[PDB]
């Protein structure tokens, strides 16, 4: 739990591949920390597209933290167009999600000034 969060948050990909072995218990994969942020949230927050792709290939469900954000909210707040492109090719249903204040990902991408996003 604690090692996987660090490895995903800082893009250490081989550590993630080692930890995510014997795929049978998805409780470790879809469990958030104290702020309710799953590994997918962290990997997208720091903009590591390879880790996001690897986690999605195991299925990560697109949950929500203690402010209603999703992976796309974080990726857009940061401006990392590549992990956004990786996310937008899976379920294609998270594009129009809302947080606690009814903000979409577009709201954040525009508020922070990321033109390409």
């Amino acid at each position: 739990k604690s090692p996987l969060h660090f490895a995903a948050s800082y893009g250490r990909i081989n550590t993630c591949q080692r930890l995510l072995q014997d795929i049978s218990d998805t409780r470790l994969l879809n469990e958030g920390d104290l702020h309710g942020m799953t590994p997918l949230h962290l990997a997208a927050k720091n903009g590591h597209d390879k880790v996001v792709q690897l986690l999605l290939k195991k299925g990560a469900l697109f949950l929500s933290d203690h402010n209603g954000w999703t992976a796309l909210h974080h990726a857009s707040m940061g401006g990392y167009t590549q992990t956004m492109k990786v996310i937008l090719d899976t379920n294609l249903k998270c594009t129009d999600r809302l947080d606690e204040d009814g903000n979409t990902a577009l709201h954040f991408a525009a508020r922070e000034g990321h033109a390409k996003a």
């Binding site: 660090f6 990909i13 720091n46």
Partner: protein
């Protein structure tokens, strides 16, 4: 000085990317959680 400031920004961003690479490649053994 606006031109100088823009060049400074560009260099700082390249440096930030290098540092993130360092963190994602380094060795961590004794200080692991």
């Amino acid at each position: 000085q606006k031109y100088r400031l823009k060049d400074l920004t560009f260099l700082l961003e390249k440096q930030h990317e290098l540092i993130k690479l360092i963190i994602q490649k380094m060795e961590i053994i004794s200080e692991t959680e």
